[model samples]
Target: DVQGIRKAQRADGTATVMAIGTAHPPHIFPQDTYADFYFRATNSEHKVELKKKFDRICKKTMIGKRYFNYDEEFLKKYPNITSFDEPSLNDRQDICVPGVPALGAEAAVKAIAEWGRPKSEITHLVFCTSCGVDMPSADFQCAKLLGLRTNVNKYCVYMQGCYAGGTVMRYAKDLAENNRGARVLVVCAELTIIGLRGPNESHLDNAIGNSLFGDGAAALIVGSDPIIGVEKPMFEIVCAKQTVIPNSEDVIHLHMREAGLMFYMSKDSPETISNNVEACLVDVFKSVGMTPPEDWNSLFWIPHPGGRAILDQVEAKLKLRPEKFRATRTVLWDCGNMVSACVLYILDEMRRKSADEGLETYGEGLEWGVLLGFGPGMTVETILLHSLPL
Candidate 1:
């Protein structure tokens, strides 16, 4: 009877992605006009050559458009938001504190709708943000907005960068498996206002970051032993593990300063990642006693769409077919890089696009797949996903 009690406490199957939902702010910027808008908004029209260089970077991004939480009114209110002479972290945090949780609730509502369960059934809240929003905890704030159960277990992760999505999903997997009847709502939301700043000629990394980043919110519901006929599962997270590229410290950096949150990426980032991505994936797969696919295209690719240059390096390194990355590329084009939130958006895109095309599965008919998440350590976290049938 004691053994039976223990057996009943654990799920028979793996934790799964039950639902995904995404939200973006109203303002949109078409890439072609972005350089002009960025320059004007930042009051940097005098930097002629710098503007020209920014225009060149925008053109190379392969992005059609991007979304933002900030616009003319925001800049007008803050006046010196883009000031290099006087950094305004306080002003930026004012917007970011409430903005993050509010946006997250928008996505969470959609995810709960798709989950088709009473919000009371959600037993956990796992919130991650690179933006580093205010106290009382963003996870707590977001939960309050959604009216989740008072006893809902809450976890907040900060400053993990784009990798936080994959990382949080790993937590969801563990929570669902270890705790009976747990449903984890994993939310990754970012506010451009937190890191929003004008380009500096003195810091090329900041300039490149300005050309690439955008804002959005993405949410997913993860649970094991989902009630049959009442639950839907998308990607069953088969295996999740992480690896750090050797000698690649500080290749990427997002930090807080008196000015605002800042982004920095060394030129060697892509090169360092390319050198070891294959090995990392292989190790993760082997950890679960699964054989690595012979061809890169044999498995679906759900990678972080951070930058065109970085993605190009990976495509060649992995010998991936162009179609293998359609979902990843589409997100980058539509959203620019939303940091950790991009992975969830990519998952949402893949499922919708694959169903429209009548693919056999949400993973474009593939049975297995890989999702890559990146952070400052030049770390790549790998999640082995088993695509469920539609």
Candidate 2:
């Protein structure tokens, strides 16, 4: 019976990104003085050596400014947040739980507005975040806040890390194509505040995390068979896939300890992921019976701006030109590693630039493109995308 139901349920058109919306908190920290702000907030100004090293590390992040949901005033209230000496998970959770959904909705409102459809038309909600760890789930809270249809199917993802960006789309594509008339509202919101901790000399990743991660949110409306003149299609989701680098699970990590979200990343992350970039992509194209572009530069690159190093690695590995990463680099510099939200920014950035340049398609006149996400498990996720007419 279930097998028969599947035959009748599939939709006729490919899943597509109808629109995109993104938002960041108001507290902006210029990288120049972030070390001072961070050191003071965490009561670590006295650690002169660590402070000095952190300052130098910040300089290399290539990030101009980073936004945070928590401000200095927040630190004044929660002294324990900056230290792992005392358990502060409850305090961090309180601050993140409310802002997560609110931030997601802020972006969702824009996506829905651009989709040109009533909120009631959204058939499914996919909310992803590494920070939110509550029972009511950010998905439920976001759905209620957005006033979406009560029966809207809700699926919440937690701790998927940066790759959740790709994971969400893979799910949405299935949801959109498997069920007729389904419109999926995909939201990825992050609050590094949940994991904010003082600079520790012992854990090198701690300082790197402080230097790179930022708070932000992104939303997208995914559906198949756009409503002609009503819903405008941005990037049609052609196909998607995931791959785990063999024996590389320890390269990146996110675990919730009493202090907060403990993030660990090795210096070799870029090396490990870069080694497999081309082959993994080749497999994705083969899945669709499309020949791999001999010149990787022919396709638009909308890979996650995980960091400057990762972008550099993929670029060099794929033999891509310097300009190929402008969108990804800009997002990293402007927003820090917004994790899951970074890819959306790159997609929006590309589309905006294409229209401004009068390109016929969103991918700088190229119809085919690839969206990639890299994170924990040294995982590499790929989404084959076809740019629609501008």
Candidate 3:
């Protein structure tokens, strides 16, 4: 009936399973380790009270672990805190160093090579993060460091925080649709540990910011059509929706300050989403003339894993089983959230699972996949991918 049918291609080519190349700094700090450090550095009169509160809130949110490029020895390099006054320029630079590109270069290079695609074939590069920045950013830095084709088009997306992954995926899909035959690379890197706030921070915002977030990165490659050796192609882009809650802009934000990058997160964020997310998804699917049960095999529920309680509420509303979030759970435990890169890591793990289970490859009778995430601006972004015949 048709001369040619569009075939779905993943960012990485592996047919049943796409390759995932991950890189963390030399130091891997488990959640308990981070908690101990946080509690020590945190100036609470009753440390026990703070620890209890922290444990209650952060429990089951991300896996109880995270990593930083540096460790306690690294902290010893800094002098004892004498005042809460302004920090030196060197201090700011130190905090930002771990979030920069050189550390992630190897991950990017390793991922690209694992996919067996030449650098020149990567027509577009999408970088997502809410961490530190050095001009020319990670995408360019990665490209230059990896010796990718100099001509590869570069696009950097930042500041969206947790939802940056969905945003990057949206851009990657749009670019692939427009080009139809080109290949694009999407990368997300986040060092949430760098933005930690101190007890002197009086704002309620710090209460939320101080309690949540971590660091990591993820990479993906999408193409207009299937490339030989790529996995069964997860989902076709059926549709997408992005919406911002009015007056909720202040609910969350990451601002650059002379002191350092400050994150403002409100307690009301969870309640706000619980009130609106279901209706929003209903409306989004209605516009596409498909019901959730009819159209989606699974939601993939990649919300910003803000914390244990937050995720619990989301799961209840969405009726998602713990099994549905296997990849997410693994990531939460293994590397924490990784901010923007979290979704890519989850997706990669899911794709790997499908292959491990020996599922059919991009053929009929496959399930629908939906990818979504939320971030600042109270923004929620969604992507629908359907499997197709290769």
Candidate 4:
């Protein structure tokens, strides 16, 4: 099956990501040092006890700051704001309708510009988000805002959670392979702040979600064409694979409620991933004729920064070196988790580092890497990549 999949991809045109751009909303907070603000908004009486717990969790998250769409001061102006009860679905939609598109468009513009291609050239557009709802949808609004062609093949991936980014790229890869000369643009944006639930829903999952998530957008240019003047594309998407662990659907929960979206992550989630991930990675690596736990050092790992524990579980299960996860830890520390847009941020950081280190060319022993993300369905979506030299 592995060889069969590889043969199919070779027969089809391989998809390549030309450029990537990421953006975050202006409102930002530097971890739970603002526990006083949080306690005040939530109307918590046991500040001393709760604040200690909050600080301990925040420190464990390894997250320095998180960006949000709404201003903290503006939120403080409202009575009992942490409860976030006044905003109906309609109110939340109003904020998301324009806000998601605007942030997505900004990132799209930067990606398109960096790719040195006109908006009119993007034949296919893929938009993804899990944090908001809009009737006209982010795809339509983003295309219009970016001035893409009216005939562009547009797709919207909504409510798929963090792994939606990997799904979107896989979709774009298919679009590029199916249609020769197709230029596809992928944009993932999340307004996670609006999805924040109140203290009434506070649990380990909600607390972890609040500690880890932030508002951000990421755009990528995927195509088969090599830009005329560009040295080489960022990375060649060699292949993708996805697996849903059986009997584990309840490990992660995201539901819509009157207040907003309620998130409940089971404490067992990290263990679930650790239990199932190695087999998935084995299949992924085998497709490319490589064996894992043996060839582990030969590949770079980019697992989604779900939380500090999730990352740690992955590392421990795989027996990976600590330095292998440096980029992931850095992203978690610098910007928290951007949900669907998080992996793109990590990839962008890797790209920057490669450039900074003067390791521009794809060379022997350094060309292989893997990207992994998990979400609802207890799913693992992975992309195996190989760099191309100019």
lDDT of 3 by residue, 101-205 (tens): 655565666667676767677777777666666675667776776676788878878677877777887787777666645666777776654465554435645
Which residue pairs collide, candidate 1? Answer: none
- Best-first order by lDDT: 2, 1, 4, 3
Q: Which regions of candidate 1 fall more than 4 Å away from where they truly are?
A: 1-6
lDDT of 4 by residue, 70-92 (tens): 76566554343366455555556
- lDDT for predicted candidate 3 compared with the true structure: 0.63
Scanning candidate 1 in windows of ten residues, the lowest lDDT window is: 77-86
lDDT of each: 0.87, 0.88, 0.63, 0.78
Please provide, for model 2 over 1-390, each residue's C-alpha lDDT reduced to its tens digit, 9 standing for 90 to 100: 998887778777999998999999889999989999988888887899888888998998899999988789868888788885379889989988988989999999998988887999999999989885898899999999999989999999888888878888888999999888899999999999888887777897866788989999999999988899899888888889999999898888888988888888888888888998887899999999999999999999888877788888889999999999888888888889898888987888888899999999988889999999999998888999999999
In model 2, state the lDDT of residue 338: 90
Q: Give per-model TM-scores.
A: 0.97, 0.97, 0.83, 0.91
Q: Which stretches of candidate 2 lie over 4 Å from their true place?
A: 1-8
Clash count (model 2, backbone only): 0
lDDT of 1 by residue, 1-390 (tens): 998888887767789898999999988989999899888888899999999999999999998898988777668677567765367888878888888989989999999999999999999999988775677989999999999999999999888887887898888888898778889999999987777777788987887887788889999999988788899877998888878777777788777988888777788977788788999889988999988988888999888987877788999999988778889899999999998899899999999988898998889888899889977888888998998898
Residue-pair clashes per candidate: 0, 0, 15, 0
Descending-TM-score candidate ranking: 2, 1, 4, 3
TM accuracy, model 1:
0.97
